[PDB]
Design a protein around this ligand. Structure first.
Ligand code: ACO
Ligand code: ACO
Ligand code: ACO
Ligand code: ACO
Lengths: 881, 881
């Protein structure tokens, strides 16, 4: 757990090799050779009973004979010695170990032994790790490595070797390269936490097959991706691959939803992985999504345009002033527009003139340069002149460059030169377009996740009634419920349903059917098989009573012949007037073994297969996320906009989805929910048929989800000295405008005291950072009071903890005109109580002398005060909270 | 046009270079250098007034000074000299010319000049052509070339150079390489006709941007692909690309349909083009679709499996006996199944043993071998041992091998070694799967096009009634017709429609609505209104008499208040059709400027965008092709078989599509047809709303289509000497079983006379060859008589022409027991009349001197008879066909 302890693995001062050997075909031999060639600054200690020296290095007979305690150890021996060697290492005092091989029946003993001695293990069957900046190569890989700024994490040795070979071809390096093996003790989330703070790393790439702890992964990825881009490839999308990899449990749309919610992006295949390596290594970050293209030929540009159109990209438009490329610069047979075709006989000088003129403008955000083989412009010379021209231009640092030099045999030297100058290069124009659109989409998703949500209109949630009804249902032994029984539960949360009636025989069915509209639907009450399709028990559109009697008798007869023993409660009759022009939708909620409950949206009438015709999301939902889900559904053509005559209403559907999310979050007894179909008619949404599967539950009900929901139990009413009453509660994303006003009503000196600097404005991004928090790692309380249905913020306090949950940093601020009423003390006391109950061990803060009020309050609250004059700093620390 | 005239271009004996020069930067200099370096067996003659010699070759001052007439000439000069130089060449007697440069305003004069002198032209704006086996490089390209068996045709210079460079990297060659430029005179269909007969060519690859004569292209590709595979890539799918290339007139789904109908396969992007080059060059033809996979790692195999699943491929299943693998030295920890994962520590010997055992079995049709970098199995050694093992195995020629060696830096030499031995190799597993599935799909499409159609249900086609009604409609200035007016026209061809009876004004609207007291289809329309969105009229929950009254009266008020100027019209009644319960479909027919009329099938989701939600086909259709269209629609998830509760009836939909095709083929006055709500309710299909746009026609009906339809006008009744009456008509694909019986009733000696050999079998493929013909290039007549609703064939004749339409080979055969009644003479006379009318010049045939009857009949018919004894052959020729 503790981030302390990974230091020995990633920055060791000494390493021991157990099983080093002189035989050239042995694993110990290869590991020793790699370590000696790495460039390490510490000692490498071989341990073996069969040799007095290995590759010129004096050896030691056994572990106990070592002159001192090694930082890191590697086992290169048969699995049958694992436990004894591990025990000896634990006795010696080593704290980190890499294990070459082990069967699956050994995991429990290994974990117990590691716990006994407080040792960390890198997954068994691991290839190893490489850290070029420390000159460390502790791996069994036959491929060399070079220094760089990209980090890679893999759960597969073959992929690791392949990527290393690709990097060798292109003269590119890394900052860290780690193989996880079986991930018994050390796992992906800890490494993400570590890499988020490494100064030499600027981007992260991952290949994954399975996970064990979803919430920690989501939180770590969300925290890490705030300042560095992260991409992921995940295999095993088909039944045969799942069987091959032994990962049959789980569902792939859940992976899609989880990856999207954390701010990452998924790549599809091997080619895109290589392109991602190139792009993350060399491309400059984007400032927009306008593209400009120039070429010495038409057809390659046409192919690029087709690729761009397939992905909904945007072409840049030239201005009238920039169009002076016609006047003198270029010959008269070149048409001036985007894309710019310089023709087959273009020379390098044309390229340079065009590049200069284009760079001195502001009409685009990225530039694509295409070159095909030609006599008038040899590849190497044109590449050299391009590199020089880009180097010497004053405004080159404002746009992103991309190069695509076609011709495999004649472009080798040009590509080599591009690599050493730090400019990205690609093999085909379609690949270039794909690489560009990847980053465009990444930025779009990150921006979309952070817009300000609106307040919800409806606020109805009668939790107690729903629990009461569900408890009564489970008491009798019921395991599923139908529309008639489910209507009150849905109504308790503000959802409408079509009325239905119960009939015990065909006579009553006919009586009620004629009492209502004759076009009706009949449904048997089947408690044995709840499946509609099994017996095909739903039939509809019966215009005449005679049809009703015939259908009822047919159902009864086929039941008594096919399956008489089943218990019969009667039929269900409902009027269905002719309506299909109203749009029909389907909503399903299911439980994933890995990520927990999942919400899916799709079309109603058609057959159900979520892998291809459904969009997904993780609860809990607010208005913004539900809107995002609906708009994704519309864009991907899986949901037809205005399928009915009336256009679809987005806001009402978002509200309904929010209500469904509330219901699912509140009641853990529900295992599955299905609305088939949901009728959309303007601003009216109604449920036609609905089913629920229920079961007893025993747990906390908060650890169920991958994202911690809003902690409603922390709300509390307080009374001040003057008698005023207010509410203390956690902060919400919807609070942004009121926070803007609150900041507006604070003086400059108080802002200087709070933020230790001068602040003239807070943008939307800072406010979003303040209001949209992860409740597992951060907490903030606000004090509010209501005036004529409008809230108002009086103060705020905050605490930010470390990933290990040991230390946290605190702050507090009160409105300038409400100083001496006791708000600060109450806020701080509530924060102290919460942090102590959460499991933290310390609070830390920093302020300056001449902030007398804060120092006095901290002394009143029991803090330890450290005034360091001559540096103008005061330290504050509180122990048991 | 004339296949004779291409010999000078493709196999010249001498060449003249107009405008050769000694300046290294001139085009003539480059052409001269290429030609002298190519290895030509003839003379190269430079013509220029500015040099006495060029690159050591004596020069001549002008064209008139040449010592003899050259076969081929090349123009390397400014476009302003084109016409004068061409006139001089025509005077000298040259018959072929390549033109470097010309603007679009010159085309008419160039065509006229070429026609005057009987000269063929390549280009203009053409890169040239290369023919390695003749040692000829007459082109302006800077990339070298090598001998091979693949041929390539391109409409783009940059793509040509890129492909040549790619081939240079991989050490592969070509048989012919030709660039078309503007295709003013020489075009694609003539080149396909020529390449179909070239002995050194075994496959063909094309890059295209536009066409000018669809009929000839389709026919030529159909003929050529019978014995050689052909792939195509076509760019310009988006409006921006179309604007860039000046090809906005066409429609891409028409290209899709045309490519499919001719038996070819379309490739998507640049990567697939490179893979296609590799596959056509090296892979052995498939005999099945079962795949086997082995690897030295799991994850690459899993990626392969995912790619295979996404394309609906088939995995092979091992037999129990092949469990020799468990014994044959594979370690105990390897699991025996497909894919077979030899572990990371696999050695070369394991590979060789597995390969031997697998090759000695019959469980699969293709084998994929994956290798990742490792210490135990170095790349080069493993490749060498694999090559030797494959070379020495007796059964290697029964399966197709594919290799995928990952790791760019370390596998260069291995890929080179694979190239020299003729084994295909690919960069990534996904690419390998894609390459395999391309050929699988190609074979599947070719097989599907040739199954036996079933006879139709003797549908009605009253052409006279439909023509009379359409002429009456146009006589009154009508430009479009609605459902009421088009009901009889649809009924004439056997298609059901909603009822069409008259009704009076709005006061009678409610009365006719209540005439049955339920919703029913009443139409109120404006004919001048461009759009139908104003109507907003659909009968859904306009049920109750109160509903009828109120809604209908309000609708009348709203509809009639809108527009005073519009010419309003009266009412007339139709009945309600249920569409909510039933499944809704859409059918549209449109006219394409290139390929002619097109038929589109869709789901009918209100929103209509054929580019992504429709399947397409070319008329005329029979039952087989219509079924193929429907099944394609179902497989792509564009139309649901289960949108309604009732399963979809394929046969009835096929029959309906055939009826629509008949209607469209018969009546050229129709420009567009739209059946928006086509209802399917099992075996019942009815049209709800339908529109027709009509216009006068003045051309030739048969020439509108890309495929010549069945020539019904050639049927004729004849009576024989004995008085029996029978029908002579062209052959049909539906005649296969009757032809089988007819062949069954012929004696062995007559079969020897007919086929000049002993034949003990006619498979389904030979019969398909006999019965499925292209009517523009082949004609066959059968004589049939009716017996109790069952037909029987008495004889058959055939004539197969050449693409130039000058010569044709003929044959005849009569049932053994019906000889001596006049059938042979009548069949031959009908054939002679038809061939003379078609425009052929000559008829040829061969037989043997013991066939007295044929010789006597040919003498009776006026043939010239030449008997060559000592060789056992008799030649027959008739001079005017
Ligand atoms: C994740 C990856 O891709 S790693 C690269 C791919 N390679 C692999 O997956 C294969 C890994 N496995 C192997 O190499 C082998 O199967 C092994 C090493 C696991 C087992 O080999 P074995 O012969 O069973 O090993 P064993 O433990 O008996 O002996 C290994 C060495 O340890 C030495 N040794 C024995 N006892 C001890 C001891 N107590 N302390 C130290 N060394 C010892 C033995 O002398 C032997 O050395 P030597 O051959 O020079 O005399
Ligand atoms: C953590 C960091 O990085 S430092 C940032 C701290 N925040 C700021 O400086 C923001 C600006 N200041 C403020 O917001 C407020 O002044 C705060 C938060 C410092 C204090 O909140 P307030 O509402 O003013 O305090 P409150 O009324 O609860 O006072 C509590 C105790 O402080 C004492 N106190 C407050 N100000 C002073 C003062 N200037 N001198 C002496 N005692 C003081 C009061 O006597 C009271 O004592 P008591 O409980 O024994 O009767
Ligand atoms: C895709 C490809 O084809 S590769 C890329 C090239 N693409 C292109 O479109 C072609 C590029 N364009 C060019 O090279 C130039 O524009 C050209 C060749 C078309 C015209 O150049 P111009 O200088 O106008 O040609 P012009 O006809 O005047 O002279 C060319 C040569 O013909 C010679 N010439 C002049 N009159 C005659 C004549 N009656 N007969 C023969 N030769 C003649 C001239 O001497 C000159 O030779 P020189 O340079 O050794 O003195
Ligand atoms: C076509 C090629 O390239 S060669 C392959 C030719 N095909 C065959 O040999 C297939 C086997 N034979 C047959 O199918 C038939 O016998 C055919 C096609 C040769 C003749 O067709 P038939 O129906 O027998 O001929 P039909 O009755 O029309 O006779 C036409 C004339 O031929 C004459 N004739 C036919 N057979 C003979 C014969 N063996 N000897 C002399 N005269 C003959 C008849 O007298 C008649 O003459 P007439 O018009 O002056 O009265």
């Amino acid at each position: 757990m503790s981030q302390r302890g990974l230091e020995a693995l990633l920055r060791p001062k000494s390493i021991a090799v157990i099983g080093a050997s002189m035989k050239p075909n042995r694993a110990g031999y290869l590991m020793m050779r790699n370590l000696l060639a790495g460039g390490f600054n510490g000692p490498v200690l071989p341990v073996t009973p069969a040799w007095k020296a290995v590759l010129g290095v004096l050896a030691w007979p056994d572990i106990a004979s070592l002159p001192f305690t090694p930082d890191l150890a590697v086992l290169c021996t048969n699995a049958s010695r694992n436990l004894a060697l591990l025990e000896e290492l634990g006795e010696k005092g080593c704290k980190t170990c890499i294990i070459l091989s082990a069967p699956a029946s050994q995991h429990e003993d290994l974990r117990a032994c590691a716990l006994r001695h407080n040792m960390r293990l890198l997954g068994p069957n691991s290839l190893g790790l490489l850290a070029p900046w420390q000159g460390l190569n502790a791996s069994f890989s036959p491929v060399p490595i070079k220094r760089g700024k990209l980090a890679f994490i893999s759960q597969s040795a073959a992929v690791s070797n392949t990527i290393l070979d690709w990097a060798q071809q292109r003269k590119m390096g890394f900052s860290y390269f780690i193989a996880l093996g079986d991930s018994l003790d050390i796992d992906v989330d800890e490494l993400l936490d570590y890499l988020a703070r490494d100064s030499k790393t600027s981007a992260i790439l991952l290949y994954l097959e399975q996970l064990s702890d979803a919430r920690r992964f989501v939180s770590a990825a969300r925290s890490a991706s705030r300042n560095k881009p992260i991409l992921v490839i995940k295999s095993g999308r088909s039944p045969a691959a799942q069987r091959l990899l032994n990962t049959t449990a789980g569902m792939d749309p859940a992976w899609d939803a989880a990856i999207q919610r954390a701010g990452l992006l998924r790549v599809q295949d091997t080619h895109e992985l290589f392109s991602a390596v190139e792009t993350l290594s060399h491309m400059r970050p984007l400032r927009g999504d306008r593209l400009m293209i120039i070429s010495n030929g038409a057809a390659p540009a046409a192919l690029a345009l087709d690729a761009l159109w397939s992905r909904n990209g945007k072409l840049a438009t030239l201005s009238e002033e920039t169009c002076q490329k016609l006047r003198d610069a270029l010959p008269e047979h070149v048409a001036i527009s985007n894309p710019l075709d310089l023709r087959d006989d273009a020379s390098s000088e044309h390229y340079i003139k065009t590049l200069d003129i284009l760079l001195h403008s502001q009409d685009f955000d990225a530039l694509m340069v295409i070159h095909s083989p030609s006599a008038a412009a040899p590849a190497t010379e044109s590449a050299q002149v391009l590199i020089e021209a880009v180097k010497h231009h004053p405004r080159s640092k404002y746009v992103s460059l991309l190069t695509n030099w076609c011709g495999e045999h004649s472009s080798q030297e040009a590509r080599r030169l591009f690599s050493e100058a730090g400019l990205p290069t690609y093999r085909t124009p379609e690949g270039t377009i794909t690489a560009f659109m990847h980053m465009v989409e990444y930025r779009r998703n990150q921006k979309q996740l952070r817009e300000t949500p609106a307040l919800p209109s409806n606020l109805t949630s009668n939790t107690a009634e729903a629990h009461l009804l569900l408890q009564q249902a489970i008491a009798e032994g019921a395991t599923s419920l139908d529309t008639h029984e489910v209507q009150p539960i849905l109504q308790a949360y503000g959802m409408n349903t079509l009325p239905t009636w119960i009939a015990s025989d065909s006579t009553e069915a006919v009586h009620i059917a004629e009492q209502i509209g004759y076009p009706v639907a009949l449904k048997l009450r089947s408690p044995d098989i709840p499946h509609k399709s099994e017996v095909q028990g739903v039939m509809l559109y019966l215009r005449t009573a005679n049809e009703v009697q015939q259908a009822a008798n047919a159902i009864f007869d086929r039941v008594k012949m096919a399956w008489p023993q089943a218990r019969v409660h009667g039929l269900l009759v409902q009027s269905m007037a002719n309506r299909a022009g109203a749009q029909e939708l389907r909503v399903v909620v299911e439980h994933d073994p890995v990520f927990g409950p999942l919400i899916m949206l799709g079309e109603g009438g058609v057959e159900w297969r979520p892998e291809d015709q459904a969009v997904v999301a993780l609860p809990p939902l607010n208005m913004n996320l539900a809107r995002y889900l609906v708009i994704q559904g519309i864009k991907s053509k899986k949901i037809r906009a205005r399928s009915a005559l009336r256009p679809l209403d987005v806001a009402g559907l978002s509200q309904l989805l929010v209500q469904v999310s509330n219901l699912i979050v509140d009641c853990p007894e529900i295992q599955r929910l299905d609305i088939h179909p949901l009728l959309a008619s303007g601003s009216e949404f109604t449920a036609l048929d609905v089913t629920l599967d229920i079961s007893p539950f025993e747990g906390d009900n908060e650890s169920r989800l991958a994202v911690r929901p809003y902690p409603h139990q922390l709300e509390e009413w307080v009374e001040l000295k003057n008698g005023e009453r207010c509410l203390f509660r956690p902060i919400l994303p919807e609070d942004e405008p009121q926070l803007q006003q609150f900041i507006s009503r604070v003086t400059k000196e108080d802002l200087y005291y709070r933020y230790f600097s001068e602040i003239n404005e807070f943008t939307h991004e800072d406010l979003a950072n303040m209001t949209q928090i992860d409740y597992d790692r951060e907490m903030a309380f606000v004090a509010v009071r209501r005036i004529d249905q409008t809230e108002e913020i009086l103060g705020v306090t905050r605490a930010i903890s470390d990933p290990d949950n040991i230390d946290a940093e605190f702050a507090v601020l009160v409105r300038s005109d409400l100083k001496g009423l006791g708000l600060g003390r109450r806020l701080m006391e509530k924060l102290i109580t919460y942090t102590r109950d959460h499991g933290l061990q310390r609070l830390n803060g920093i302020t300056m002398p001449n902030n007398r009020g804060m120092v006095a309050l901290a002394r009143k609250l029991g803090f330890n005060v450290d005034i360091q004059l001559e540096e103008g700093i005061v330290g504050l620390t509180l122990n048991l909270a």
